[model samples]
Target: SQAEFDKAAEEVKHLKTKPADEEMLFIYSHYKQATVGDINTERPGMLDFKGKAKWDAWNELKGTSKEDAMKAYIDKVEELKKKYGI
Candidate 1:
């Protein structure tokens, strides 16, 4: 399990291409879901622009199972790796 997660983390860290905002959101959601079960914290106030954006990104994945989230994260990195030749 640790090895699998390690691979995913490493792949994401070494990503060379700039992914689109939508891709970043998917990464944000999956990574958050993998680390934290769900969006249990308070939503940021509207004034906290970046905070609110990340909060919403994570919240949008509220129902994703952790296993699925991890898989998605790993899959995304693999896709990016191929796309970026990294």
Candidate 2:
């Protein structure tokens, strides 16, 4: 289902409106979990707030299976599409 997942990823890029902060974090976490499997690098420095937030979000999904993460990512994008009236 990577094909479906890839399509969903593309769709997110064209969303009519930006998702809320929490939603963006959710998407980031799932996308990282799906594509990269786990967080392997050191956390970003404190001064880099956005990077730190993203790193923490992805870290929380550390143990997720890639397939599950992909499915979640796709579903979230579909939900956001409807929510944002895209």
Candidate 3:
């Protein structure tokens, strides 16, 4: 019973430590691949900020191009790598 419980607990812990930053990129890649269940394609990774954060980042972007958005994201990763050595 304890062994089974340990596995379940670890799963919860993994979710709690989900590394949202990397997971976001992973999802972005998947969203690029996500089919809208129709013949046409879709761009889903536009922004998963959700709720108030969505509006907040949108305002912060202020109509930046996809190229600029990508540059910002890449710079963020570089900063994080230097800070966290990850």
Top candidate on lDDT is: 2
What are the models' TM-scores? 0.73, 0.85, 0.36
* 5-83 per-residue lDDT for model 2 (tens digits): 7788889988888788788888889998988866998887874547888788999889888888889899999889888
How many clashing pairs per prediction, in order? 0, 0, 0
Stretches of model 2 off by over 4 angstroms after superposition: 46-49
Q: Which stretches of candidate 1 lie over 4 Å from their true place?
A: 44-50
lDDT of 1: 0.73
C-alpha RMSD of candidate 1: 2.6
Q: Rate the local accuracy (lDDT) of all candidates.
A: 0.73, 0.83, 0.36
The per-residue C-alpha lDDT of model 2 at residue 5 equals 77
Q: Highest TM-score: which candidate?
A: 2
Q: Give the TM-score of candidate 3.
A: 0.36
Off by over 4 Å in 3: 1-50
Give the TM-score ranking, best first. Answer: 2, 1, 3
